[PDB]
Design a protein around this nucleic acid. Structure first.
Ligand SMILES: [Mg+2]
Length: 580
DNA sequence: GCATCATGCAA
DNA sequence: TATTGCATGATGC
């Protein structure tokens, strides 16, 4: 049965009530500077559909959109807020976002449209977006009648589902998580995405030019060492040259051919000079394809800015994700890739890039939740944790810790935070499982509190059915009761890791909210540009650096109070590369 | 065109 | 057989 609504030709006063479910539709997946194809409003007075060209040109509607006292319930308000920002219109008063509410109730559902969220509550009187717009090439906005009813049905579902969702959030003790953390953060992300990051495309082109030269030389050298040419990029064609023509050992093979991943090639390097060249070709090639060419593809030709979209409702841990481009995976570890960061520059003259990052927030969070005396004391002394861990598991004094010991203790630390596995540790360190297990047992002997936590959290996930974070984020772990070892083991690792990665996510998100409140109080021109899990990157007038050197770390360190201190480092410079 | 896998970049 | 992600070139459907 069809849904009743008014297909309005003009905006009326009753469409502007104090509370309503609002739908400002942007069909294009990337909403930056994208069209708003239709608008729906559902309130106490009824259901309405407005053509965007008329609604967005109506002073009364635009004023209502920006009146913070007129509350709106929406799904993905960030997408609408950004699309409206590009049209110079301010969206305020969003008091409920169904996408964020659904995400907090269960990130595993993978809710990405109103239909999916409604299903959680046995409401199916709304179609999935894909069913209406189609996918990929067949994608498309349908005719007005079809479009109009879809938007109205979505607004009706939001109107209906707000109460039940808020009720369950409250039961879960997640009401504040949504209203005080994710919803306000959503607005901050929209500002960040809208602001964008300026790119020095001439610099990017210079780099790509030299990469091309280098790639060509290595490529030539590779054909030289193989005795012929081939597509170095087809691990299969590649696998034949290496494991058949050159007879390299096959210590790993793919579910369809031979494995030529870097860890494998690294072990093969000693047998033939072609290997080091394949690795080098892989490095340069990755930079070229993904970071020079890929980047340039999404830079706005007029402003030379890139506008990522932070997916706030996707990761199972509470972390954000970044796409088109992903600005959370720009090279830094190897000097050659790190140069890519030289192309990310301030958007205004005489402005600089300022980057602040937490020092070992995950291990500090672990010390806090595990309440391990040894680990807490280590951070109270602000010790180098990897050196301290080597000292403890290898039983030596700081002076006797050698570089190899620190490196191995470091790997143990990563395994501890990821959810320890002897096989996992063995693989990483390239040692036997028995040897890795010995390392782990030594670790647990030195950090008895961490051992008890890992044991207890797994039991808790089994008991309750989920694990939670500092700020009450949750993740259900159904596989924790699986009678399949591999399946259960993975869920156990998640139980151990999620509260750590998730709490660190909780902390930096609150820091962003706190930081923006402080920047507004001080009327500073500085503003957030990016978040990369444990770090915040802003740009600001060179004249604000000194104030920022004091403000940013402070706000970040004080976002949450733990049993150990939080410590934030920072740097700034003329490009992202100089901020580090 | 569209999905897959193998690869590699980040925290 | 360590945690969470996203983009790419191949390859084939
Ligand atoms: Mg750091």
């Amino acid at each position: 049965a069809a849904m009743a609504f008014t297909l309005a030709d003009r905006v009326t006063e009753e469409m502007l009530a104090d509370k309503a479910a609002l739908v400002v539709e942007v069909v294009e997946e990337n909403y930056h500077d994208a069209p708003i194809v239709g608008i729906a409003v559902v309130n106490e007075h009824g259901r309405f559909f407005l053509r965007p060209e008329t609604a967005l040109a109506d002073p009364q509607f635009v004023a209502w959109l920006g009146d913070e006292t007129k509350k709106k319930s929406m799904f993905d308000s960030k997408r609408a807020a950004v699309a409206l920002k590009w049209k110079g219109i301010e969206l305020c008063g969003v008091s409920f976002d169904l996408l964020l509410a659904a995400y907090l109730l269960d990130p595993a559902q993978g809710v990405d449209d109103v239909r999916a969220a409604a299903k959680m509550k046995q409401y199916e009187a709304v179609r999935p977006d894909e069913a209406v717009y189609g996918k990929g090439a067949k994608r498309a906005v349908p005719d007005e009648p079809v479009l109009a009813e879809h938007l109205v049905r979505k607004a009706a579902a939001i109107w209906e589902l707000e109460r039940p969702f808020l009720d369950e959030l409250r039961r879960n003790e997640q009401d504040r998580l949504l209203v005080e953390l994710e919803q306000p953060l959503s607005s901050i992300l929209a500002e960040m995405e809208f602001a964008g990051v300026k790119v020095d495309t001439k610099r990017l082109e210079q780099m790509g030019k030299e990469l091309a030269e280098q790639l060509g030389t290595v490529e030539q050298r590779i054909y030289e060492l193989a005795g012929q040419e081939f597509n170095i990029n087809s691990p299969k064609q590649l696998g034949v040259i290496l494991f058949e023509k050159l007879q390299l050992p096959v210590l790993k093979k793919t579910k369809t051919g031979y494995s030529t991943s870097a860890d494998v090639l690294e072990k093969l390097a000693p047998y033939h000079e072609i290997v080091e060249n394949i690795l080098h070709y892989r490095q340069l090639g990755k930079l070229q394809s993904t970071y020079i060419e890929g980047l340039l593809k999404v830079v706005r030709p007029d402003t030379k800015k890139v506008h990522t979209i932070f997916n706030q409702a996707l990761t199972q841990t509470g972390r954000l994700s970044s796409t088109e481009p992903n600005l959370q995976n720009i090279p830094i570890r190897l000097e050659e890739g790190r140069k890519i960061r030289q192309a990310f520059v301030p958007s205004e003259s005489d402005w600089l890039i300022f980057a602040a990052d937490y020092s070992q927030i995950e291990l500090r969070v672990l010390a806090h939740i595990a309440e391990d005396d040894n680990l807490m004391e280590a951070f109270r002394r602000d010790l180098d944790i990897h050196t301290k861990t080597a000292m403890d598991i290898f039983q030596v004094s700081e002076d006797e810790v050698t570089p190899n010991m620190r490196r191995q203790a470091k790997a143990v630390n990563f395994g501890i935070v990821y959810g320890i596995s002897d096989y996992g540790l063995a693989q990483n360190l390239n040692i036997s499982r028995k040897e890795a297990a010995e390392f782990i047992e030594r670790y647990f002997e030195s950090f008895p509190g961490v051992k008890r936590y890992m044991e207890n959290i797994v039991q808790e996930a089994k008991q309750k059915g989920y694990v939670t974070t500092l700020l009450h984020r949750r993740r259900y772990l159904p596989d924790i009761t699986s009678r399949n070892f591999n399946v259960r083991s993975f869920a156990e690792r998640m139980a151990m890791n999620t509260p750590i990665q998730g709490s660190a996510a909780d902390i930096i998100k609150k820091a962003m909210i706190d930081l923006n409140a402080r920047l507004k109080e001080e009327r500073l021109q500085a503003h957030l540009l990016l978040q990369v899990h444990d770090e915040l990157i802003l740009e600001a007038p060179k004249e604000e650096m000194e104030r920022l050197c004091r403000l940013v770390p402070e706000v970040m360190e004080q976002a949450v109070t733990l049993r150990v201190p939080l410590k934030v480092d920072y740097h700034y410079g003329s490009t992202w590369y100089d901020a580090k």
